[model samples]
Target: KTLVYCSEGSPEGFNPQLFISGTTYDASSVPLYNRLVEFKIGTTEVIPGLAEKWEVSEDGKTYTFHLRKGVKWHDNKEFKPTRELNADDVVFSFDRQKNAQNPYHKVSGGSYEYFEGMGLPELISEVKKVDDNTVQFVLTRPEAPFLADLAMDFASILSKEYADAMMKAGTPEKLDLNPIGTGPFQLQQYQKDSRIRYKAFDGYWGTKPQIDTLVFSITPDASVRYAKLQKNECQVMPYPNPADIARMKQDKSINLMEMPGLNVGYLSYNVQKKPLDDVKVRQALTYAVNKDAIIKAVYQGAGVSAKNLIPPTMWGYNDDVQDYTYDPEKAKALLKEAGLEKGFSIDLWAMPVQRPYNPNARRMAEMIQADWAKVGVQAKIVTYEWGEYLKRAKDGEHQTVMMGWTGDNGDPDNFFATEFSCAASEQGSNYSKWCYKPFEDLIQPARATDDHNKRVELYKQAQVVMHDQAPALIIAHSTVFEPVRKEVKGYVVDPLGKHHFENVSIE
Candidate 1:
């Protein structure tokens, strides 16, 4: 059996080393490599392709994983008893993460600022090979989410031989086009901006996929992809526009599944810029725009209106916290208080491809422009492609921007600490350049708490601070629409916005 997938963007590079972005293309290309430590199923967790079981140390600072023996790489590369998945692979992956020259490190910029205080740098002192089948990780402190972090794309294991060859050849560019990992499929061929093909690895250690061939057809235009889906040109279609979901459901031939998206779309105000740097101005802007209206008008009633940056489906959502309401009178008063009664003008940068749930992203930005005008805020809207928009946002070139974040890990830390904390600003994740001691204090203690309820309380406090600061006004949480052929089954969508194809099969 064969299963075909359609995506708007093609993989820029097949090499896992260069594919640090967690977008669909990068994730779908490498999952076959068997690098991820754990594969999450809904809320149930399963150890897939790597460690079978693991234990925490008495002090909660160390984790020792017992690797299943006899796993093999895609190319019939066996895991020799003497070379069983051990400490070397773990240590090497971490070293690459810390390497300044590594592209992943540069792309993440300083977004991983939480690692600074977390005993990761000190706890991961060394990876010691206890035996071929066992590996131990020592931490500076009890790191609860260490395992979850390992499941992230950045922590995916790399073949030492393959990595060394790329470094020695001084041609990292070539490495980006090819990747080799111990997974269920092997990359057969990939054409840039066109298509990618993967073949099942018969040597796979676990249950082999029933489907022998997987093909990803790249269709950049949303309309074209929708047409392909209607024609049965693709077996699975990701990133479907919300407006299309109802129609697809009405079509008896199509099967549509809707899940609460793990992604959050928000409007950011550059704190480093003038006028926006004023708290009254930020709060006024927040109150002026009607988020519920945007959800209906822009998203076509496809997503839940957001009151906070973190989506409600996440673990740390606070129901008790209050967000800014749409109050034009209050907004006008606030602007007067901020000495902007005459009105202030600023540019709002938008991206055509950034809003995956909505194909008419530019039209959405224009609507926002009109909303701001109602409050005497002159918003000049600018548009760019996805990649260029990210570059501009990272460089702090825009005073205001419409952006979305798909949590790298389904953890509150990914949203609060990485996106708003002062320390994260230096690393580029905090695009708003927002740094408040109160916000940092709220997130710092949550890391040390082993109790689940205590952690939730801490996150709630942080959300309150975020609402008060209004650095970024979250507008809505889009619903992820995954369209698959009637024959496809077991397709699970991760809360982090990644699609796991391992368990999926064509019946």
Candidate 2:
């Protein structure tokens, strides 16, 4: 049986480490490779993927991973592995992501976006191959979320031999185009912005996929995706617009699953920009926007207004943090206090593509624009192509930016430190470029310490600083939903927003 799954966006590339987008992971790494550690089906429960077991030092600064023996890389037409995966492959994968001087990092444009986003390059002092089956990671400080971070798609290990082959061919950049992994399926065909085809790899280290082939049908239009799913042309579909949920649920043939998402949709204000740099002005902007309107109109009531940066699902989330209520009079007063009584014009950048946190970023931006108008603020909605949007925002090119994330791992540090810390400005995760020492100091203690009580205390203090500083407007934390055909079995909603196709089957 062949499962034709519909994805909303096409991948930028097949290399997981090369890019930071989830679409690329879903289209490439998720089906084609294995990570050192992986999340179990339906939750963020850490399980051994390539490595069978692992140990950590008492200080929590060192990680020792025991690799699973006898795992063979998939034999492909482009390149065949002469030997099974070993220490050399593990060392090559980590070295290439962090060390630019390494032979392979510069060979291809290997940015390793996620690794840099988590500040791993700076934290990890060394990645050493202890022996044929052991690899150890020594961090500069105790990183509590280190292991959980490894389970992400970007941490998916690549074949060093395959990478070497691509370099020898003088098409070093083409390494991602041709992928080989120890995953359940191997890439057979990939046509950009159209479709990706995968065939079951018999030599996979895990249980063989029940299906012979898997097809990822790229359909960007929401309506066309629904039409295909209804017609049985596709078994599973990516994000169905929230407005269509009621209609989709009415059809018994469609399987609709939902959960309060592990994500947040917010607008980050560029602190370096004119009036936006003022705290009162930032607070005014936050108070001016009506979150209820965003929930009812933009999200179609599929989401709840968010008060803080951390979502409810994550540990050490501070619900007691400050929340902004819509107040046009107060918003106008704050602007007057800042001496911008008449109005202040600024760019409010929106995302070009749909995402889990905010289904339609453009619609949300328009609604925000209208709300800001009432407070005598001029907001010109700005946007670029999806890839360009991410790149430019990372470069700190926008005044007010729209962005969100479905939790990659179930850790508060993953949400706070990765996006909020000063280090993130260089790492490209911090869009606002507002980094305060008060917030940074608290998180390091929270991230390095093992005491749950100490962590909760530290994170709460940090949230208060975040609340008062107001670098971003906390908008909505959405409910995640997916539509699938009734025939697709073993499909469960992962809190991290990843679908495990290896466990899925066609009835």
Candidate 3:
């Protein structure tokens, strides 16, 4: 039996480390690969995945993981693993992201955005194989969320034998496009912008997937996905439009799930650009728009306005930090103070597909455009394909871009350091391209310390800095809603907005 899921979009690549989209992670990491550790389905709690257990040093810099001996990697027509998973595969997975000199490092555009954004390359001294079933990771400094960080999609393990064979065969790109992992599912076929078909991995080390096949019917539009769900064409779907929630709830054949989403949707100003580079101007722009209106109009009671990068539900959210109130007069005055009384024009990039944080990006962008116009700022709305939208935004092509982040791990560092740090700017994950040292100083200290209270204080201070220096306008944190057919069983709504199907079966 096949489980048809109405996915929002196609993944840019199969290698999770190379891309950051949740859509990509669902297709690549959730089904096709496994990390050393993983977030338990429907929760932020970390659990052993490929590694059975791990030990950390007293200082917290070194971690030794004991691997499960009989774990197997998925196989395809081009490559078959001659042996089971070992420390070598684990070492290879991390080394490819950490070492530039490694041969596979340059394959498939070589941008480990999340790896670089989280400062892993700088923090990880080495990932070495201690034995066939054991691996050690030595960090430059103690990272408070190290284990949880390993649970992220970017840390998904890949087969070293497949990498070596692919490289020797001179089709190294297949390592990403054609993946071989130890996850519960194996890719059978993928049609760009169309569909992806995956078969349940027979030799999966963990719990076997109940469904025989998983199909991602790549439907980009929200209305189309809902239509497919109505006809029972797809059993499960994510990021349904806020308007459809009441209707879906009334349908007895549908099971609608809800959770307080750990996410933020915002408009990032590329501070590398001239006018936006001015902090006063950035603040002026922040004050110009009405976030409350956007939440009402765009989210339609589905979300609450976000005052900080981290959601209110997450720890280390600074309740003391003050948000910029919507005042067009103050915005005009600030613009005049910045010596730009005439008001300027900028491109506002919108997302092509719906996200858990932003259900309708085009509509949201249009509302922002109207708000900015009231302050004499001319905003020309722009959009591209979902993949192109992210790539171009990452490349700093837009003056202002509509972007959002769903917290991968529960840690506050996952939000601040991973998205806004100076290193993230260089890595292209920081869409704002605004690197402020004061903000970095607060978060950097927060990452190295293991003391819970101290890290909380540092993150609180960092949120204040982020608020004062407006690289991006903090928008709203949504209530994530998923609609599934009544026949779908054992399906849970992930708090982080990811979908898992290992235990899911059709009744």
Winning model by TM-score:
2
- Using lDDT as the measure, name the better of candidate 1 and candidate 2: 2
Which tens-of-lDDT digit does each residue in 220-260 have in candidate 1?
77778889987888878777765577688887766787766
Query: Alpha-carbon error at 334 in model 1, in Å?
Result: 6.8
Lowest summed lDDT over 10 consecutive residues: which window, candidate 3?
A: 38-47
lDDT of 2: 0.84
The lDDT of model 3 is 0.87
lDDT per residue as tens, model 2, 1-507 = 799998888898877888877677887778989989987776655779899998888898888999999999986676878889887788888898898888878655667778887778899999999998899999998987887888888888888888888889887776777777888898888887689899888988889998779999999998999999989988888778756888988999988887668888888988988888899999999889888888888877578788878776565778777588889999999999999899878889988888767888878888989999998887899889888888889988899899986676777787788788889877778888888899988998888875668988998888899899999987888877789889888888877776658777899
Residue pairs with backbone overlap in model 1: 110-427, 123-138, 123-139, 123-140
Please identify which of the two predictions, 1 or 3, would achieve the higher lDDT against the true structure: 3
Off by over 4 Å in 2: 164-174, 260-262, 266-294, 315-410, 418-442, 450-473
TM-score of model 2 vs. true structure: 0.73
Sort by TM-score, best first. Answer: 2, 1, 3
Write down the TM-score of every candidate.
Answer: 0.71, 0.73, 0.70
* Candidate closer to the true structure by TM-score (higher is better), 2 or 3: 2
Among all candidates shown, the one with the greatest lDDT: 3
Per-residue alpha-carbon lDDT of candidate 3 for residues 1-507, written as tens digits (9 for 90 to 100): 679999999898899989999999999999988888877776666778889998888887999899988988888899889999998888988899888899989888889999987778888998998989999999987887998889888999889889889999999999998889999999999998689999999999887899999999999899899999999999999888767888998989998887778888888999989899898899988888888888888888788888889877666778988899998999999999999998999999988888768888988888888988988889999999988888888888899988888776788887888799998899898999878888878888888776778988998998888888899988888887899999999998876667888889898
Q: After the best TM-score superposition of candidate 2, give how far the Cα of residue 320 lies from its true spot, in angstroms.
A: 8.9
**Cα distance off (Å), candidate 2, residue 408:** 5.6
lDDT for predicted candidate 1 compared with the true structure:
0.70
